[PDB]
Amino acid sequence: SSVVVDTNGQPVSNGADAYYLVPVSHGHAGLALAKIGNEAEPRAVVLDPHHRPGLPVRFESPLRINIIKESYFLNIKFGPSSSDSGVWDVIQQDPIGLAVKVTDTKSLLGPFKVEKEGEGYKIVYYPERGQTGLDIGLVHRNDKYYLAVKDGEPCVFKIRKAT
């Protein structure tokens, strides 16, 4: 129900602005892309210590309101707003498991919500909309933290406008 809010106390907008996801327990890391399996191009969404504050994200609902609430199903993406590249999804891939990855397509309703958790927010993934959600957390591998489903152990973020 509640409005999602940035570090400056302002409502997080629907598509119009980009935001850094700043982790509270991994301060010197920021979002980036990395390679997973035998893939050539990096498509896994990671928190890279060697990258800060990282690549910013937009939060997108089809609803014609310019704020995001914690109950809205969202797309989450790197890059510009109107585009279909850099769109986050969750994909089963060894060695990570239910990995957060980027793709080139965008559903009308994305599978994520941003929900209040402790001193910031967590990203939650819904395999179908009616169901309960799975917290996005971190899988440590190759000196980086791959974002993946890890229910019970969310990665908690402050949402900072890129300005």
Binding site: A16, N66, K69, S81
Partner: protein, 223 residues
């Protein structure tokens, strides 16, 4: 509103703004004490603002009135977007004047091809953002339910309709949520959702108010 025009003062007197420190949704004044808007616009302690054309300046013709009861439709379903309608009861009656008047409810549903007036203070660009100071307006036709289903397969229910242009260029947008779609002098629609704004083959989707009239009348009666 993308590809619309400046309404003018007096031209959409039934339009209100839903506010809580900032404008976040449109709405329609349906009588002196009752506003209708979108369920997804629900927020605690909504203040309704009436008589505003320029939202950023205090024109004096305004009236600022708090919600006494915000009533989301009991079957409103955030997973499907179906039943996207809310009623707000104002704590005091709106005094009516040149810039504040009510819009009445349809006695029947509207047909395909009927030209409608859609209004709001939302984004005016299809790519990027630009928010207007004055209320904007757009005339858009109702599309047949079959083409609405074709545009958005899987998502259109009996309580939604599509309006606008499959060409793109003209549509409601983020910020217009809750606002009026008025056809033949009646409140037929509520700005709800769409895939982007003013994109080809992706028209606005609006709550079909005609299905809700018995609920609206009952809700007002009993409260």
């Amino acid at each position: 509103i993308v590809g619309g025009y400046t309404c003018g003062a007096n031209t959409v007197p039934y339009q209100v703004s839903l506010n809580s420190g900032y404008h976040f949704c449109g709405g329609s004044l349906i009588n002196s004490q009752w506003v209708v808007s979108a369920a997804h616009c629900y927020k605690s302690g909504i203040q309704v603002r009436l008589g505003e054309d320029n939202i950023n300046v205090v024109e004096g013709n305004e009236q600022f009135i708090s919600a006494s009861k915000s009533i989301v439709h009991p079957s409103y379903n955030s997973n499907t977007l179906n039943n996207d309608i809310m009623l707000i009861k104002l704590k005091s009656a709106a005094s009516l004047n040149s810039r504040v008047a009510s819009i009445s409810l349809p006695t029947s549903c509207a047909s395909a091809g009927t030209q409608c007036l859609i209004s709001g203070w939302g984004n005016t660009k299809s790519s990027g953002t630009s928010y207007p100071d004055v209320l904007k307006c757009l005339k858009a036709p109702i599309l047949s339910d079959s083409s609405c289903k074709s545009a958005y397969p899987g998502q259109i229910t009996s309580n939604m309709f599509c309006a606008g242009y499959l060409e793109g260029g003209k549509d409601s947008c983020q910020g217009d949520s809750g606002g009026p779609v008025v056809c033949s002098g009646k409140l037929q629609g509520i700005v709800s959702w769409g895939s982007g704004c003013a994109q080809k083959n992706k028209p606005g989707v609006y709550t079909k108010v005609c299905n809700y009239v018995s609920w609206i009348k009952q809700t007002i009666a009993s409260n």
